[PDB]
Amino acid sequence: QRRHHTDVGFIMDRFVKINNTNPTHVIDLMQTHQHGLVGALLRAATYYFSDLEIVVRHEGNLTWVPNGAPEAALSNAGNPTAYNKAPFTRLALPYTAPHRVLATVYNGTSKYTQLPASFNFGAIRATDISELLVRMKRAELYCPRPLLAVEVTAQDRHKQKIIAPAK
Amino acid sequence: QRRHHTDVGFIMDRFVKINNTNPTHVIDLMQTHQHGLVGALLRAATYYFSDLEIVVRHEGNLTWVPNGAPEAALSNAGNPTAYNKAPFTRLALPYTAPHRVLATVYNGTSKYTQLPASFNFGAIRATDISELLVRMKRAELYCPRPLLAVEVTAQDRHKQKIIAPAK
Amino acid sequence: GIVPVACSDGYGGLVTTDPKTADPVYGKVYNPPRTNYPGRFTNLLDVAEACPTFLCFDDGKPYVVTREDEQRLLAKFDVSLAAKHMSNTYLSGIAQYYAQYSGTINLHFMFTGSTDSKARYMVAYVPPGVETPPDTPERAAHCIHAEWDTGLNSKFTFSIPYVSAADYAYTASDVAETTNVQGWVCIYQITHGKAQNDTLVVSVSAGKDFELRLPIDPRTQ
Amino acid sequence: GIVPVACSDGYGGLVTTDPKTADPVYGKVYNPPRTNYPGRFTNLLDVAEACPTFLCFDDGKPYVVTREDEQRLLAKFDVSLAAKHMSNTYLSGIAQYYAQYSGTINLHFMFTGSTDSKARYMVAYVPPGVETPPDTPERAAHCIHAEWDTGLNSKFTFSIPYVSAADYAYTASDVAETTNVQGWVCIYQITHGKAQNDTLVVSVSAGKDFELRLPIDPRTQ
Amino acid sequence: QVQLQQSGGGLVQAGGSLRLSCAASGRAFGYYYMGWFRQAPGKEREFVAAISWYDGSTSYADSVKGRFTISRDNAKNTVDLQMNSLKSEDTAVYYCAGDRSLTVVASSWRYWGQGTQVTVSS
Amino acid sequence: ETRVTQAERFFKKHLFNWTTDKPFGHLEKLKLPTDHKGVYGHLVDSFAYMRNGWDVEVSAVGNQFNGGCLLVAMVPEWKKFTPREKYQLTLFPHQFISPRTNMTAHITVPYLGVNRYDQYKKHKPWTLVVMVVSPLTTSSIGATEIKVYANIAPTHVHVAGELPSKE
């Protein structure tokens, strides 16, 4: 038997759109749509570790400040600045969070329903951002959690129309 | 003697236009013109197996859903999406049908003159499609069938004008 | 001189799942190791195989109750990952993201009934054959069936064979193709002693050779 | 630094039959093997050589009937893949897609006549020489000819030699170049005993050293 | 064809130990419950033991509980009945059988072996 | 799957009538499996998925005083034939039957199709084809009509997924 298409490191290695984009954006993997392939297969884990690659469609230059840097540092070009080409920009970011692994659910708070603000990958800024795609490289998952399929109201099972060569 | 130009794997490795194109298209090799080189040499086999490469001239992005995927999956970018360049797009598709080999003639039906809908390679969608070319790679054929030449009405044999250097 | 190159037409575009990497922007970052972290899973089917999950019978309960009526048919339920009974299962949750599947599926029966109650049952699987499932508890003996009595164990596991035409079967049962799609399981009660509200909980897990093939993103987004 | 390259002018376009591959979009797909599938053919000429197919004589029949008249000429038919008699043949069907050919062509004669009828025949091939085929059954003996009698077998195979000027000959006989293009075969009846409706079926297949050269797509599309 | 071959029988003193082997061939060894049945002279076949195919489990008859051990080897397609604390009542022919069924009845097991003779000497 | 050796037995039948008024191109067909009334029919109805080959022995009873030729063939994935391709039925497995020379044919074919198992209630892969190559010539000392037979037995019958009864 071949079990390569259900691999955790293989199913996570694809681009996924992040719907919420702002002129200043904090890159967090929990902004993915919860019902997509990557989003739903990610909420079915407790902890995770990953690198990232992003495709951004911006005007003007793009600045990236790592995790923990002040917000005022986004207005200086000393931090890695990317000059815009025609179609878009591809960048590869590392993992900079202080914790060894991140999490998708947190039981409580962290200040002396909402995850701590320290669960992010950095931030990006430009004069505006039109689209943003993210990609999880070398992903790993821990402590599985329930994964649910679509419900059936009164039928025997869900019916979805498949692609057919009918003319 | 040299018999390389009549090879089955060599005569099938060339681009052929598919006349019928729609905004949503189900890629089936039986849409080829029946009287062309590839079409006629393909109808002269009972079963076949092949990969594919396609050249598409589209507007907007192009999505591909494999065989058996629901039709509603063509509106999500999680499935392989290709962003349009200037001239056209070249992609290489695998063989995804459940059956070991496909067929060109079917004797009967398959539901508890028309082939079953499960004989396809996938589907493609864009905001519109202007042209589509297909290419059979590593083709193989089984169980030969009759192949017919053009008929002669009342002459001794068919006459076709050949290219000549006459000035 | 310098090397001549040809800029091919059609190549170079961005595809969501291309295998080529990007250019780094921030080098020399060493992250603390995540070694010896308990509970690391690398394959979804391994998790599906290891831990079974309950079935959802009628009215929304995970057990079937013994019936005091002439119909010896305790119940039937479709064997399909898109069926109504397998709606609340981890296996169906994984399977909703793939197009084709092939392999065995296991069934777990566990007797939570009282010790002082003894009974006899049988289970019967019917592949997509005859037009009507053998509702008769005797007609189903001609199928591939098994017999278990709650006198040597309270646990009994039954494997569902893979029978179909092609090599791989669809996971996303089509709008067309009516009549019993492929398979149904019905459970009969040969006898029962003082079992009026005695319970029976059924759970389903993946087989040893299960496999899912083509990843898709089918939901509405 | 980085490598300098020169973007050549004229290269890079898309040609329908270029030998370069495309960039994959969907990896890790393992298809079930199609091993030990009976009836796999890899060369068209192998199929053409193995199985002969019938000729289409006048009125649309695949046999020639014995004639009770002074003309000992049973019939003649052109040897050309674009002739009228070879119209319903697999060899002509293959040959219509190529420009040049070279090799031998075999002829099969089979006697479906009654056992109680005996006869004598001969076959004569005439290359593109004299202005008129030797209609005389004796004049054709000076050609490359053969003699067969239906007294030792009911099957007789005759090979048609390849005679022309150049190395390769056209397959698509031109509008110009009138007069007998290259070759004709005529069959004579030396004698016949009680053979008035006795039949004779002729079929044609490729030779051992046949070959087709240049693939084209000539039909009207 | 699902074929069962028994081995390991013979004569042995009371209070000793003996091991029986059931060599099975077929594509359905991994889905079938496998147990043993003993047929005393002049008596019908009776369940003595059984082993599951998924978790492993165990179930022995009351007459042999605490004295027997039944084990399976999926990689070798062999099922063994490790026997200890012999008594004279155990002199009988031991039959390897399997099916998807787990019962005490013998008629419900479709496939049977040829049987092996075990004699207990007092 | 299990092999049923009791379903492989012969069963003689009737193909057609060979008179003198039937010219070249007279075609008769008999798709397999037909309505077998033995164990094989019980397998067809009370079992779902079967695979098997075939072998056939056709005999034309007559005498050497008649003239003619008969062509018997096993076409896979049968389809209606236009007159033009009737000249090319030698591409399929075949033997020539002529009362002058031979009396019995023998064709053995394996199982082949898109699916590894087939439901013969829906799809019929093979077919027995008998066509008149040269017309039956006869005189006052020849038989005026010839009867053709047909022995037929499946080979290597394999079935999976046993089904219940109907009583």
Short mmCIF file of C-alpha atoms in Angstrom, two decimals, chain A residues 2-155:
data_model
loop_
_atom_site.label_atom_id
_atom_site.label_comp_id
_atom_site.label_asym_id
_atom_site.label_seq_id
_atom_site.Cartn_x
_atom_site.Cartn_y
_atom_site.Cartn_z
CA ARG A 2 1.02 3.62 -0.63
CA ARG A 3 0.33 6.18 2.11
CA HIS A 4 2.13 9.21 0.69
CA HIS A 5 -0.86 11.47 0.00
CA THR A 6 -1.86 11.58 3.69
CA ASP A 7 1.59 12.69 4.87
CA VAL A 8 1.59 15.58 7.33
CA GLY A 9 4.69 17.16 5.81
CA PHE A 10 3.29 16.82 2.27
CA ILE A 11 -0.30 18.00 2.76
CA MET A 12 0.85 21.25 4.42
CA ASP A 13 3.26 22.32 1.64
CA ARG A 14 0.97 24.44 -0.52
CA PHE A 15 -0.06 28.08 -0.84
CA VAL A 16 -3.19 29.22 1.01
CA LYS A 17 -4.79 32.67 0.84
CA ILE A 18 -5.14 34.81 3.97
CA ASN A 19 -8.37 36.77 3.66
CA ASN A 20 -7.65 39.65 6.07
CA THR A 21 -5.03 42.06 4.71
CA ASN A 22 -4.24 45.54 6.02
CA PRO A 23 -1.53 48.14 5.30
CA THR A 24 0.16 46.82 8.46
CA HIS A 25 -0.26 43.08 8.98
CA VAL A 26 0.85 40.68 11.73
CA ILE A 27 1.50 37.31 10.11
CA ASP A 28 -0.33 34.66 12.17
CA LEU A 29 -1.17 31.18 10.87
CA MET A 30 -4.51 31.28 12.69
CA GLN A 31 -5.92 33.74 10.13
CA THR A 32 -6.50 30.90 7.65
CA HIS A 33 -10.04 29.89 6.77
CA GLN A 34 -11.13 27.21 9.22
CA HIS A 35 -12.91 24.99 6.67
CA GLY A 36 -10.21 24.74 4.01
CA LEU A 37 -7.80 21.86 3.64
CA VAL A 38 -4.88 23.54 5.40
CA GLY A 39 -6.95 25.45 7.95
CA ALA A 40 -9.02 22.46 9.05
CA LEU A 41 -6.06 20.07 9.07
CA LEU A 42 -4.21 22.65 11.19
CA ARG A 43 -6.93 23.17 13.80
CA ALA A 44 -6.76 19.38 14.30
CA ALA A 45 -3.41 19.74 16.10
CA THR A 46 -2.48 21.27 19.43
CA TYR A 47 1.09 22.45 18.75
CA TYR A 48 3.03 23.07 15.55
CA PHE A 49 6.36 24.29 14.19
CA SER A 50 7.00 25.61 10.70
CA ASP A 51 8.96 27.99 8.52
CA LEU A 52 7.17 30.20 6.00
CA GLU A 53 7.22 31.57 2.46
CA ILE A 54 4.92 34.42 1.43
CA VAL A 55 3.78 35.99 -1.85
CA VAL A 56 2.73 39.64 -1.49
CA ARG A 57 1.23 42.02 -4.06
CA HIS A 58 2.07 45.52 -2.86
CA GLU A 59 2.79 49.08 -3.93
CA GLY A 60 6.07 50.61 -2.86
CA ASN A 61 8.65 48.85 -0.74
CA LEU A 62 7.91 46.13 1.82
CA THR A 63 9.48 46.01 5.28
CA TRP A 64 9.65 43.00 7.63
CA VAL A 65 10.36 43.27 11.36
CA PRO A 66 10.91 40.04 13.33
CA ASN A 67 8.99 38.89 16.38
CA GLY A 68 9.35 41.13 19.42
CA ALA A 69 10.47 44.23 17.53
CA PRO A 70 8.65 47.47 18.39
CA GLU A 71 5.93 48.73 16.07
CA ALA A 72 7.84 51.98 15.44
CA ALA A 73 10.61 49.96 13.75
CA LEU A 74 8.38 49.45 10.68
CA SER A 75 9.19 52.98 9.43
CA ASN A 76 12.95 52.39 9.05
CA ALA A 77 14.58 50.78 6.03
CA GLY A 78 17.38 49.25 8.10
CA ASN A 79 15.09 46.28 8.62
CA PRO A 80 14.88 44.01 5.55
CA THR A 81 13.27 46.08 2.79
CA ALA A 82 12.16 44.55 -0.52
CA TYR A 83 11.88 46.75 -3.60
CA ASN A 84 8.83 46.01 -5.71
CA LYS A 85 9.09 44.21 -9.04
CA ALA A 86 6.27 43.92 -11.56
CA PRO A 87 4.04 40.94 -10.59
CA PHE A 88 4.71 40.33 -6.87
CA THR A 89 7.37 39.45 -4.28
CA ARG A 90 8.45 36.04 -2.94
CA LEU A 91 10.25 35.92 0.42
CA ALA A 92 11.29 33.17 2.83
CA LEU A 93 10.96 33.90 6.54
CA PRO A 94 12.41 31.99 9.51
CA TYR A 95 10.81 31.05 12.84
CA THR A 96 11.54 33.78 15.39
CA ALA A 97 9.11 33.20 18.27
CA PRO A 98 10.68 32.75 21.73
CA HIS A 99 8.71 29.57 22.50
CA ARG A 100 9.94 26.19 21.29
CA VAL A 101 6.58 25.38 19.64
CA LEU A 102 3.43 27.38 18.99
CA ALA A 103 -0.17 26.42 19.80
CA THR A 104 -3.70 26.58 18.43
CA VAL A 105 -5.59 26.53 21.76
CA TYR A 106 -4.59 28.21 25.02
CA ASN A 107 -6.10 27.42 28.43
CA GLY A 108 -6.01 30.75 30.25
CA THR A 109 -4.05 33.98 29.86
CA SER A 110 -0.44 35.16 30.08
CA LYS A 111 -0.67 38.72 31.49
CA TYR A 112 -0.13 39.36 35.21
CA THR A 113 -10.96 32.51 23.37
CA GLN A 114 -7.83 34.52 22.57
CA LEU A 115 -4.27 33.33 22.07
CA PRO A 116 -1.31 35.31 23.44
CA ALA A 117 0.07 37.98 21.13
CA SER A 118 3.49 36.27 21.14
CA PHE A 119 2.23 33.61 18.68
CA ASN A 120 3.24 35.20 15.39
CA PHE A 121 5.92 35.19 12.70
CA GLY A 122 6.61 38.93 12.41
CA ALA A 123 4.96 41.82 10.62
CA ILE A 124 4.91 43.42 7.17
CA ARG A 125 4.11 46.93 5.98
CA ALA A 126 3.74 48.72 2.65
CA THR A 127 1.71 51.66 1.38
CA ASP A 128 -0.97 49.02 0.74
CA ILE A 129 -1.32 45.25 0.33
CA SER A 130 -3.76 43.66 -2.11
CA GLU A 131 -3.14 39.93 -1.59
CA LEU A 132 -1.07 37.70 0.68
CA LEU A 133 -0.35 33.96 0.43
CA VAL A 134 1.46 31.82 3.00
CA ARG A 135 3.17 28.44 2.77
CA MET A 136 4.19 26.11 5.60
CA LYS A 137 7.56 24.44 5.02
CA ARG A 138 8.87 21.45 6.99
CA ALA A 139 5.72 21.41 9.11
CA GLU A 140 5.31 19.18 12.16
CA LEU A 141 2.27 18.57 14.36
CA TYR A 142 1.69 17.27 17.88
CA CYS A 143 -1.18 16.01 20.06
CA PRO A 144 -4.08 15.32 17.65
CA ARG A 145 -7.53 16.84 18.23
CA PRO A 146 -11.00 16.02 16.83
CA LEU A 147 -11.59 16.62 13.12
CA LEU A 148 -15.18 16.93 11.94
CA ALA A 149 -16.78 16.43 8.53
CA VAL A 150 -19.78 18.26 7.12
CA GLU A 151 -23.08 17.31 8.75
CA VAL A 152 -26.02 15.52 7.14
CA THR A 153 -29.39 17.14 7.86
CA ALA A 154 -31.83 14.38 6.88
CA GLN A 155 -30.18 12.43 4.03
#
